[PDB]
């Protein structure tokens, strides 16, 4: 799930750079969604969970901004 979480967000970032909000959104929601599921299942501590949460919360905001841009 870790690789899928990173590989997903990684593809979303590149997409956003190539004027691909659509492909970037699907990859973003897929990455963040997989990240959260990984935390609820397994985690290290509040510290680590925080770093993963902040990165997810920020990624989620960008998603809604993309879907809204085209919508």
């Amino acid at each position: 799930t870790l690789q899928k979480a990173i590989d997903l967000v990684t593809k979303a970032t590149e997409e956003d750079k190539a004027k691909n909000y659509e492909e970037a959104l699907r990859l973003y929601q897929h990455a963040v969604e997989y990240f959260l599921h990984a935390i609820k299942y397994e985690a290290h501590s509040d510290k680590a969970k925080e770093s993963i949460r902040a990165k997810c919360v920020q990624y989620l905001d960008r998603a809604e901004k993309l879907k809204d841009y085209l919508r």
Binding site: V32, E33, K49
Partner: peptide, 13 residues
Amino acid sequence: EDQLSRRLAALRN
């Protein structure tokens, strides 16, 4: 976590 977790679930669905 529930904040973004909820808004995220709505995005996909």
